[PDB]
């Protein structure tokens, strides 16, 4: 099974440097051409460049938009691909995917899940996790909703799970909204039967790696 895993993305100051890494597995690394493609938060997909297989001793190619700034390299002994980004700017803020070429300038048969890069002068702020609970259970309605409000954080992203992954049915984690303060805020909700409120426990596991903030808040 082919596996591509990106890491290294985070908040970067405008005009700064950052280095992303892509660890592979499940296939012979040096036999394939490795690429880098990025996606701005709602826009399209833009190819950045590649580094050939040892059928060129690591021949590289880059798009005009990043040539001179970004540099691709690989380490055979580690089955890892790298993207050195320099002179970063606002328009470089995107999710960076390392992809695998089936052949030579063919197509991208495999993709990683991506690592988010944020080019901003703003600072890192961990979120506050507040519980979302109704005023009263109400025996009339058979279904009740609970939740957690992950407020005031920067930058993206934040991870939210319920009862350590045990509860997944009925969960709806909403996309973050950028508040007038430049800080994000999002709500993660879950619907459960009213016959459970006061019987079993409900905890939301919030992780904001950028600020090293992991919070397990109890709702009921």
């Amino acid at each position: 099974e082919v596996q591509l895993l990106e890491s290294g993305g985070g908040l970067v100051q405008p005009g700064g440097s950052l280095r992303l890494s892509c660890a592979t597995s499940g296939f012979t690394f040096t036999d394939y051409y490795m690429n880098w493609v990025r996606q701005a938060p709602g826009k399209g997909l833009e190819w950045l460049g590649f580094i050939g297989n040892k059928a060129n001793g690591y021949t590289t190619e880059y798009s005009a938009s990043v040539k001179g700034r970004f540099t691709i390299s690989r380490d055979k002994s580690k089955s890892t691909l790298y993207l050195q980004m320099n002179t970063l700017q606002a328009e470089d803020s995107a999710i960076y995917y390392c992809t695998r070429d089936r052949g030579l300038r063919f197509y991208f048969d495999y993709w990683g899940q991506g690592t988010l890069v944020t080019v901003s002068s703003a600072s890192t702020k961990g979120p506050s996790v507040f519980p979302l609970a109704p005023c009263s259970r109400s025996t009339s309605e058979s279904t009740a909703a609970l939740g957690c409000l992950v407020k005031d954080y920067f930058p993206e992203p934040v991870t939210v799970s319920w009862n350590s992954g045990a509860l997944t049915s009925g969960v709806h984690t909403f996309p973050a909204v950028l508040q007038s303060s430049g800080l994000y805020s999002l709500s993660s909700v879950v619907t459960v039967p009213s016959s459970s409120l006061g019987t079993k426990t409900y905890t939301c596991n919030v992780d904001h790696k950028p600020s090293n903030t992991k919070v397990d808040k109890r709702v009921e």
Binding site: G44, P131, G147
Partner: protein, 213 residues
């Protein structure tokens, strides 16, 4: 740079119906590749070399076309196919992608389940008060949420966030948040959330009285 232009850029089609997406290259290309991007996930190879289906891709997907004009087809659309699709070429430097085509399914009208949540004690002690209103599992996504404080209609002091269509039931969910300071929050009693939606005969209102939760 060979520019690929997709059409249409958006589609809403009933389950089992046909979806046909077009990809036009500004200059002739040898092959066109299609990727599918499901919500929250990275793009995945759907069709390569114009008409070859990647491994595991179901029979409802197909590809055709030559030179400058290409076509991607889903003969019997399913909720699991909700996503944005992209065409790609590598016949010129650099390899480009089309702008993408958003595909969503159409289902029967489903009224939203409205819930309101008062601000927590822990937050209130910090000086602010967030009041959340939830609209769960509805269709279509067109929904109107109005906040009322002591029956006074609010505006500009709230923010909405809607989820991508769910493949399990083909519905949407909406989160509305009203933010006030603790002091402003404490000088009013009735906090209400009025919801207008096609699946509701009359607007649904969910509320609570401050001090009473």
């Amino acid at each position: 740079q060979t520019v690929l232009t997709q059409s249409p850029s958006s589609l809403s089609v009933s389950v089992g119906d046909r979806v046909t997406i077009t990809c036009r290259a500004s200059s002739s290309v040898t092959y066109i590749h299609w990727y599918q991007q499901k919500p929250g996930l990275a793009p995945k190879s759907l069709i390569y070399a114009t008409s070859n289906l990647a491994s595991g891709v179901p029979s409802r997907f197909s590809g055709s076309g030559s030179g400058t004009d290409y076509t991607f087809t889903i003969s019997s659309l399913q909720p699991e196919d909700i996503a944005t699709y992209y065409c790609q070429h590598w016949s010129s430097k650099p390899p480009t992608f089309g702008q993408g085509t958003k595909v969503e399914v159409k289902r029967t009208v489903a009224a939203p389940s409205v819930f309101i949540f008062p601000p927590s004690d822990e937050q209130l002690k910090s000086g602010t008060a967030s009041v959340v209103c939830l609209l769960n599992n509805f269709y279509p996504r067109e929904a109107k949420v109005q906040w009322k404080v002591d029956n006074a209609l609010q505006s500009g002091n709230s923010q909405e966030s809607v989820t991508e269509q769910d493949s399990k039931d083909s519905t949407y969910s909406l989160s509305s948040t009203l933010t006030l300071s603790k002091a402003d929050y404490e000088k009013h009693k009735v906090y209400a959330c009025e919801v207008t939606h096609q699946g509701l005969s009359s607007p649904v209102t969910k509320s609570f009285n401050r001090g009473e939760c």
